[PDB]
Design a protein around this ligand. Structure first.
Ligand SMILES: [Zn+2]
Lengths: 141, 38, 137, 58, 77, 97
RNA sequence: CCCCGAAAGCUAUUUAGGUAGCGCCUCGGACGAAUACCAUAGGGGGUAGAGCACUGUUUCGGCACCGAUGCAAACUCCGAAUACCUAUGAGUACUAUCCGGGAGACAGACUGCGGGUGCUAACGUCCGUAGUCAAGAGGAAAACAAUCCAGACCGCCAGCUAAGGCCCCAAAAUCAUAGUUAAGUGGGAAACGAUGUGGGAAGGCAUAGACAGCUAUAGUCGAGUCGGCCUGCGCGGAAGAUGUAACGGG
C-alpha cells in the first residue's frame, strides 16, 4: 500500500540562488537536500525527485576563520610522486565551479543515482546564466 | 638568532614579544641576545 | 651514594605506591624546606646531586637536613637474557616518595638564597615540588 | 500490611549471582515486569541490594 | 645459572572447626592448632598435638579470662 | 574582639566523609568546639576567614569569639588539620576558654 | 524434527598434544523444603590502614644511654570493610540429598580488580577473583571474537524504549537558555618556557596630585596603576620514508 514515486510522473522545477556573502557548507547542505528531493512528500530513495538549481556569483562564496588561506585541496596523478595541492583563495579565483562541485558531491550519495543528481546543479561565476528559457524562480536559501 | 625551547630575558635591554604566534626575545644593544622559541 | 649498612634480605617485592604522606610533611629541623607534590621514586645519585647543588649555591654557610634515605633495593636482569631462571641482581637503591613528603630543609641561611638554591635543585628531580616555611599550627 | 510496587528497569544478564537471586526472590522475571510485594525488612534488603536496576513505588 | 630455592611443605589444614553458638557432641574436635592459641575450659580436652575436643554434649563458647589474658574455649551443657 | 569568626550549625546530616567533602567543595571548613560544662558543638566556618585569622600570630595565643546565630562561644585554637600536599586547612578543634 | 546442555580444573602417571579417579553435563528411579536469595542473633580472625612496644634499618642533637625524626613481604602495642560458619523467620522459587545407565573434557583467550616475575615493557608470563567469547545472532564504537546495551520459537509495510544520537552522505532539534575557545584547539605526544584570555581571595599607591615618557630631586602632562598567588580554556616544545592519511568523509 505504501507506493513509490514513478519516474515518468516526477516534475523537476527550476530555481536560481545567489551565493554572495553566504557560507559554503551551510549553502551546500540545503542544495544537497533539494537536489535529492528530501523536501517533497513524494520522496523515494531509489528515484530522483529533486529540482534544478542554478548558482550565480559563485566566486563570492565565503568561509570563516583563516580557511581562505588554510583549506587545502589535493589531487593525485597515479604517477609516482604526483600529489598536487592548492588552497581556497586560488581555487575560488580560478575554478569556483570546482569548489561547489566538491562541496555538494561530498554530501550527495555515491553511485549512478548520485551522479545523475549532481547533473542538475549549474554553477556560473558571473551574475548571468544561459537558462532563461527554463524560467527559473528566485530561491533564498 | 638562538632557536631554542626555553626563551628568557637576560638583561634589562631585552624584550619578550609575540609575533605571528612565535615568542621572540629582542635586545636593544646586544644583537646576540636575539632568541626565538622553537 | 647512601646505602644501608646491613639488611635482613637482599631482594624485595615490587609493591605499589599509593596514598599520601601524612607523616613527615611538617618542618621540624629548619625554617624553610622543599616538599614534593606528586608521587614517585628518588634515587641515591639524585639525592647526592641535589645536595651538592644546594650546598654549592649556599656556599656551605648553613645546615642542610636530608630527610630521605634510599632503603629499598632494586634489581635488574643482566642483558641478552631470556625470561626465567630466578630474580635479577641488585643494582641500585631508591626511596619511595609520596605527595607531601619533605626532601631537604635549610637552616641558618637567608630566605632568598635558600629559595634560589631549592630552585636550582628542583631542576634535577623527576617530580614537581614546592617550598614551605615553618608555621605555628 | 503496607505494600510496595517494584519494577525492573535493566537487564540481569551479566549481573552478580546474588543480585540475580535477589531479583528472582522478589519475583521480577524481565524488563518492565512490575510486582506487588509486602513492605518488610526482608524484602527491603533485596530491593536495596538490587537498587541500581529496580524502581520502587511506595 | 640456577636458583637454589624452590621448596615448600604440603598444607596442614589448621584452624577452627566449630564456632561459638554451635551444638557439639562428645568427641567433636573444636580447634586444630600448632600451639596453644586457645586453652581448654570446662568440658574440653587437650590432645598430644594440642588439638582441643569436646568431652560432653552441649554448645561451644569462647571467652577471655585469667591474669595472662589467655583465650579459652568451653562447652556449656 | 580582634578575632570574631562567623559560623553555622552543622547537623547530623552534614557530618561524615561525603558531607565533609561536599562542604569543602562549597568552600567551607568543618570544626568542633569542646570544653567543660557543655557538650561538644559542631560548626562550619568560612575558608577565607579562617585563613585570614591563620596569618596572624596572636590568633594562636589569644581568645577568639565564634558566633553562630545569637550564640557566642569564647574559645582558643587547639588543633589544625592541613592537607599534606596543598597545605589548605581541613578541620579545626576549639577548646572553650 | 523436539528437550537439556559442559570443560579446558585438582590429584597420579618414562607423564607433559595419552590415560585413570574426583569436579562439571544428560537420562531413570527413591524422597520432599530437609535447599537458595534477604533480614535478625551468635562466632573466630591479623589482610587494607596505621604504629614503633619486639626484630632489623635511618637522620639530627645531649651525655653503651636519652630527646626528636622516618622506614619494612618473610616486624607488630593495634586494627576494619568484605568473605566464611551456625541458629530463627516473611516472601519468592520443584531446590537440596541418595542409587544407578550414558558421556564429553583434563592446548583456553581478552577485560576489570588484588598480586609474584619483567623495565610499574609486551596482543609477555604465572596465581586469586568477576564478566564475556569459546558454544551467542541483534543495536553502538568507520571497519574491529574478549568493550557498552541486550539473550534470536515463527509471521506483521503496528507502537514504546536501552547504549548511542538529532547540518548532509544517513533516522531524528541548523531546538531553548547562560557562559568559554580563535588554536580547525575540538580531531596524537612530556619536563619546561611565555603570557592570550575568563573567573576568585588577598596586598601596594594616588589631584597635599600614583604609573610611562619628556624638560631643569623638581615640572608643564594627567585619573588609575604597580607586583604576587589560585583557578577554566587555549600557544610553543612536535622530524621519515606510496598518496591528503592523527574528526569515516563533506
Ligand atoms: Zn639583552
Amino acid at each position: 500500500k505504501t507506493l513509490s514515486a514513478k519516474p515518468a510522473e516526477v516534475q523537476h522545477d527550476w530555481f536560481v540562488v545567489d551565493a554572495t556573502g553566504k557560507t559554503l557548507g551551510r549553502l551546500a547542505t540545503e542544495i544537497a537536500r533539494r537536489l535529492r528531493g528530501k523536501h517533497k512528500t513524494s520522496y523515494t530513495p531509489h528515484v530522483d525527485t529533486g529540482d534544478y538549481i542554478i548558482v550565480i556569483n559563485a566566486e563570492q562564496v565565503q568561509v570563516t576563520g583563516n580557511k581562505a588561506l588554510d583549506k587545502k585541496y589535493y589531487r593525485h596523478t597515479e604517477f609516482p610522486g604526483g600529489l598536487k595541492e592548492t588552497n581556497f583563495e586560488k581555487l575560488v579565483a580560478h575554478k569556483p565551479e570546482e569548489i561547489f562541485e566538491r562541496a555538494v558531491k561530498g554530501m550527495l550519495p555515491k553511485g549512478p543515482l548520485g551522479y545523475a543528481m549532481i547533473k542538475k546543479m549549474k554553477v556560473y561565476a558571473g551574475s548571468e546564466h544561459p537558462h532563461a528559457a527554463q524560467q527559473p524562480q528566485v530561491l533564498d536559501i | 638568532m638562538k632557536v631554542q625551547a626555553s626563551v628568557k630575558k637576560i638583561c634589562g635591554s631585552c624584550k619578550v614579544i609575540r609575533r605571528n604566534g612565535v615568542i621572540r626575545v629582542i635586545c636593544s644593544a646586544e644583537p646576540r641576545h636575539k632568541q626565538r622559541q622553537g | 651514594m647512601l646505602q644501608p649498612k646491613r639488611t635482613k634480605f637482599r631482594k624485595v617485592h615490587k609493591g605499589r605506591n599509593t596514598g599520601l604522606a601524612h607523616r613527615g610533611s611538617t618542618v621540624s629541623f629548619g625554617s624553610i624546606a622543599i616538599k614534593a607534590t606528586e608521587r614517585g621514586r628518588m634515587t641515591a645519585r639524585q639525592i647526592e646531586a641535589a645536595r651538592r647543588t644546594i650546598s654549592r649555591r649556599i656556599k656551605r654557610g648553613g645546615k642542610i637536613f636530608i630527610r630521605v634515605f634510599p632503603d629499598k633495593p632494586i634489581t635488574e636482569k643482566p642483558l641478552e637474557v631470556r625470561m626465567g631462571n630466578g630474580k635479577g641482581n641488585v643494582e641500585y637503591w631508591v626511596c619511595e616518595i609520596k605527595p607531601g613528603k619533605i626532601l631537604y630543609e635549610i637552616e641558618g641561611v637567608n630566605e632568598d638564597l635558600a629559595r634560589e638554591a631549592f630552585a636550582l635543585a628542583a631542576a634535577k628531580l623527576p617530580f614537581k615540588t614546592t617550598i614551605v616555611t615553618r608555621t605555628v599550627m | 500490611m503496607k505494600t510496595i510496587k517494584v519494577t525492573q528497569t535493566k537487564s540481569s544478564s551479566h549481573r552478580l549471582k546474588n543480585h540475580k537471586l535477589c531479583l528472582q526472590g522478589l519475583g521480577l522475571r524481565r524488563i518492565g515486569h512490575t510486582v506487588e510485594v509486602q513492605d518488610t525488612p526482608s524484602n527491603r534488603g533485596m530491593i536495596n541490594k538490587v537498587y541500581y536496576m529496580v524502581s520502587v513505588e511506595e | 645459572g640456577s636458583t637454589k630455592n624452590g621448596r615448600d611443605s604440603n598444607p596442614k589444614m589448621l584452624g577452627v572447626k566449630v564456632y561459638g553458638g554451635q551444638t557439639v557432641t562428645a568427641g567433636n574436635i573444636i580447634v586444630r592448632q600448632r600451639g596453644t592459641e586457645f586453652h581448654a575450659g570446662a568440658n574440653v580436652g587437650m590432645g598430644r598435638d594440642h588439638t582441643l575436643f569436646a568431652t560432653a554434649d552441649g554448645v561451644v563458647k569462647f571467652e577471655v579470662k585469667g591474669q595472662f589474658g589467655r583465650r579459652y574455649v568451653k562447652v556449656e551443657t | 574582639a580582634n578575632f570574631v569568626l562567623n559560623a553555622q550549625a552543622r547537623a547530623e546530616d552534614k557530618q561524615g566523609k561525603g558531607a565533609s567533602r561536599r562542604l569543602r567543595r562549597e568552600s567551607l571548613v568543618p570544626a568542633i568546639i569542646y570544653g567543660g560544662n557543655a557538650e561538644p558543638v559542631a560548626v562550619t566556618l568560612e575558608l577565607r576567614e579562617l585563613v585570614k585569622a591563620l596569618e596572624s600570630n596572636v590568633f594562636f595565643e589569644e581568645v577568639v569569639e565564634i558566633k553562630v546565630g545569637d550564640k557566642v562561644e569564647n574559645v582558643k585554637i587547639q588543633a589544625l588539620q592541613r592537607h599534606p600536599a596543598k597545605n589548605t586547612p581541613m578541620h579545626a578543634d576549639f577548646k572553650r576558654a
